[PDB]
């Protein structure tokens with residue numbers, strides 16, 4: 001399924017780039033109209049919508065709950081939301097606002113015992129494990145908690161195996177070398193991890209540049225294709241992407 005994605009800083013739809021140390025920097029503003037944008041996506045048939053709340057990522061006290069509530073109320077498919085989700089109270093607040101699935105990032109690497117508790121409390125269908133991956137010179141799929149600078153000492157597979165016994169189901173795997181590049185996604189990466197873990201519903205993220213890039217993912221076993229920039233820049237429509245995917 002095609003999963004259109006929006007990044008939000010204080011009500012504004014933005015493009016961000018990842019920096020050397022993993023931090024996100026703003027590049028350009030697309031506009032102050034997330035609701036009509038999401039509704040355009042939803043109306044065209046998007047099966048899931050992905051939001052990153054960068055304001056809340058910087059300070060969880062400033063989680064954009066009122067905005068998120070209005071966006072969920074405007075659509076009729078699951079909305080998944082990430083952006084520095086670090087405590088169970090943060091997860092609960094998002095779910096209470098009507099978010100379908102909460103995307104969990106670096107906390108799942110740093111504090112696995114804590115996050116295992118979240119799976120027990122919230123259930124596997126409400127949680128998406130985000131894995132930002134950099135494939136190093138040795139072929140290891142490094143999970144980046146700090147971008148390109150330091151090696152986390154944790155692999156994609158190590159983390160997937162960590163959470164399978166508590167029922168892990170959804171994994172968002174971003175290739176950080178392809179994020180925002182319009183290169184095409186890392187097809188062989190997704191072919192490999194999807195076959196390696198048939199019980200996991202993987203979402204691909206990063207690199208989609210044109211309709212052919214969506215076609216290239218069709219046989220991989222990927223269950224969701226996240227598309228940010230190419231939809232925002234009008235390379236193709238959500239309708240066209242769905243017609244291609246199916």
Ligand code: NA
Pocket residue numbers: 001002047242245246
């Ligand atoms: Na679809």
